[PDB]
A paper describes a structure:
In previous work we have explored the potential for establishing a bump-&-hole system targeting the bromodomains of the [name] (bromo and extra-terminal) protein family. Through this function the [name] proteins play a significant role in controlling transcription and regulating gene expression. The phenotypes generated by said inhibitors have been used to investigate the functions of [name] proteins and their significance as therapeutic targets. This process has been limited by the pan-selective nature of the [name] inhibitors, as they typically target all [name] bromodomains with similar potency, hence specific proteins/bromodomains cannot be associated to specific phenotypes. Through structural analysis of the bromodomain we hypothesized that a leucine/valine substitution (L/V) would be a more conservative change than the previous L/A substitution, resulting in a smaller ‘hole’ but still allowing enough space to accommodate a bumped ligand.
With larger bumps, however, the rotational flexibility of the bump becomes important, with the semi-rigid 5 bump acting more like the equally flexible 4 bump than the 6 bump of similar length. The following compounds met the selection criteria for both the AlphaLISA assay and DMPK triage and hence underwent ITC profiling: 4, 5, 7, 8, 16, 17 and 21.
Numbering used by the authors: 347 to 454
């Protein structure tokens, strides 16, 4: 669909150089143990990240744009859920969600 196309564009923007300063925490799945964090998967039921979104997109695993949005939003929600509101990673999530929500709203 033309909506899934629009979403692919958004994904590419989220991955582009412009946003790399606050998008990077979300490039790959959280490796919590590597960060010295060992309850992440007790708190977070379903991990999400942009490489996963990209894999689904590439593999045509998204039934519609709303499923795409559900994943991206979940990626942010996990971050907000697990971390305190003053966390710098939360700031990064908010800045990147700035981008996502705005471009997603421009969807035909
Ligand atoms: C998993 C551990 C919890 C957070 C943490 O305090 O890690 C030390 C963590 N912080 C970070 C984190 C903390 C501060 C800043 Cl400014 C950016 C990212 C984090 C880092 C990463 O490096 C590859 C990848 C994922 C991260 N992440 C995401 C997504 N959600 N929370 C985090």
């Amino acid at each position: 669909s033309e909506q899934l196309k629009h979403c692919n564009g958004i994904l590419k923007e989220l991955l582009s150089k412009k946003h790399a300063a606050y998008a990077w925490p979300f490039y790959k799945p959280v490796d919590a143990s590597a960060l010295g964090v060992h309850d992440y998967h007790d708190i977070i039921k379903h991990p999400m990240d942009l490489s996963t979104v990209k894999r689904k997109m590439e593999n045509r695993d998204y039934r519609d744009a709303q499923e795409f949005a559900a994943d991206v939003r979940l990626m942010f929600s996990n971050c907000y859920k697990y971390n305190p509101p003053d966390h710098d990673v939360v700031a990064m999530a908010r800045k990147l969600q700035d981008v996502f929500e705005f471009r997603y709203a421009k969807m035909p």
